[PDB]
Amino acid sequence: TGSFVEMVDNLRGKSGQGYYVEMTVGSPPQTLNILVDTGSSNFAVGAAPHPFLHRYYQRQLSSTYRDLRKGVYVPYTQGKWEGELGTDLVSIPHGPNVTVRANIAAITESDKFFINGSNWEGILGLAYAEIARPDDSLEPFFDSLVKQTHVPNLFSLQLCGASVGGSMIIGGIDHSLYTGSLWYTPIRREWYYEVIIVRVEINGQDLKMDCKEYNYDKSIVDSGTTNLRLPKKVFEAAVKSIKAASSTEKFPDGFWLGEQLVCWQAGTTPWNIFPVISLYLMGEVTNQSFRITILPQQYLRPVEDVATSQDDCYKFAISQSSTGTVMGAVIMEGFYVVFDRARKRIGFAVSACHVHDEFRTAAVEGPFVTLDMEDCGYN
């Protein structure tokens, strides 16, 4: 049929602080909440006390704990930690019914990494080898899982909006998590989950750049990132185009920088004045592409605020980047995304749980005749 009921709704989170899954490590197993991250490729867990950790990995208590007698250091855009390598038996209570020996980094030192009141104490790097620390020699979690178990080389994510929730379906595709068709873009290279963007529209108006601008110096699908991050030039034209489309209301300058909340009486958010955003992505067929479309409900992240109800408050969740395009949680929150590693591709369908209104919905449409798409990549 297509129903993975044990794995539906296995993710949780706070807004702006990421999506996490419940995992266990060791013997006897220790329950820990682990961040689901397609932008990195290292499994790592808090193994010591910290001001923002409620619990941590007590490796001396694990009878199956192995020491790799080695060190590991991982930097991110947000934060960095260093830890002691080693292995232990790992399992996901609301995942596939398996236990696997895998690589673990026990975090001893970390800087601006563990978030206050996040409720997660580690991270699952789901991206490929080519970017693992200390190097490509370290086999990542999902590669271990497929080695030691019969589970298909494939996971899907449904990240829902709004504490948030979602579904990581390991080893398959759940039919209840989308509507309409799955459209596939090729993973251009197995390191990040790198895709190619061939065109951008705001309310159907072409942003009109050379397409290389959209993929400078890469475009990636990153569950571990909150915002839709765009290259400086692309960001500045989108904001200009979005400012124009929303011009019946003016907002403070700081709002467009992510520095300031905008607010409306409850239920009166004027979604319809804000534009739709379309990203055309390279297809499987030659000279073909499809487009995904998100709503202001995806790129205006809601913020609870400290004064009263009676106002619904939001943050602009599109930000500037220097490392390329990052299709983070604001993009992924409109779609069921299928990381089809077995067939070097990434699937997009309309999410069955996405936030929208009566009059507009997130969309995934195709095909479109689009030429010289290979040219859009960086080299």
Ligand SMILES: CCCc1cc(=O)[nH]c(N)n1
């Ligand atoms: C805990 C956050 C880890 C992280 C940080 C970051 O900057 N990017 C990604 N993909 N992941």
